[PDB]
Amino acid sequence: GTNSRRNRLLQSDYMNMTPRRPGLTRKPYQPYAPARDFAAYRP
């Protein structure tokens, strides 16, 4: 028991529940979705 946690865990907090979402993304997802219907089947 006893308080005074001290030396939590050198780097990387115990972030109860779960560690902050890991980025690991970088660069845009560039969805790129060429749609262009047909402008109302244009007469």
Side-chain angles (χ1 to χ4, degrees):
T2 83
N3 318 85
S4 67
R5 291 180 185 276
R6 64 172 69 84
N7 181 7
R8 201 86 176 78
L9 212 301
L10 44 146
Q11 118 181 326
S12 79
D13 60 354
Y14 184 92
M15 184 60 239
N16 185 202
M17 312 120 189
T18 233
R20 64 111 179 77
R21 350 70 123 59
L24 194 90
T25 52
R26 294 175 65 210
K27 314 191 169 162
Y29 190 87
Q30 69 217 342
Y32 94 94
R36 289 177 179 165
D37 176 12
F38 221 94
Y41 181 73
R42 248 167 175 290

